[PDB]
Amino acid sequence: HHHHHMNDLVESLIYEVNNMQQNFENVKSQQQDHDFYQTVKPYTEHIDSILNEIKLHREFIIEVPYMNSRKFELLIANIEQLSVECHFKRTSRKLFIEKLKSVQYDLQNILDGVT
């Protein structure tokens, strides 16, 4: 409900989802998984912190155009999943990039809505 904070939260996830794309590109070129405890755990926990905040604004966000309760829950899960998958060389490019595009698509609609 407080939307310059929501703005920054959403812009924060946008930045982070872009970062996830670069991480995926790095594990793929390098053909090496990132270290679970030194890289993956801390990263996914930092993503969880942002998501925990954005969940506090659930009631507002679900009411913006293009959003609803179900779509909000899938968006969160999709972002969590990407935050992990981007660290694995075996992650499918086809499925990862499709899910990333879908997440950036939702995030933009939210950004428009909270603005």
Measured from the CB atom, is 35 or 63 closer to Cl ion? 63
Residue with tokens 């998958």: 85
Q: Which helix (H) or strand (E) holds 112?
A: helix 93-113
**Other beta carbons less than 10 A from residue 65's beta carbon:** 8
- 3-class DSSP state of 35: coil
Sign (positive or negative) of CA dihedral 41, 43, 47, 50: positive
Q: Least distance (Å) from Cl ion to the CB of residue 55?
A: 18
Residue number of the CB atom closest to Cl ion? 104
Measured from the CB atom, is 40 or 107 closer to Cl ion? 107
Q: Least distance (Å) from Cl ion to the CB of residue 45?
A: 22
> Are 82 and 103 contacting, i.e. CB atoms less than 8 angstroms apart?
yes
Q: Least distance (Å) from Cl ion to the CB of residue 5?
A: 19
Q: Least distance (Å) from Cl ion to the CB of residue 37?
A: 29
Measured from the CB atom, is 26 or 109 closer to Cl ion? 109
Instruction: Give the binding site for Cl ion (CB under 5 A).
Output: 14, 70, 104, 107
Measured from the CB atom, is 71 or 89 closer to Cl ion? 71
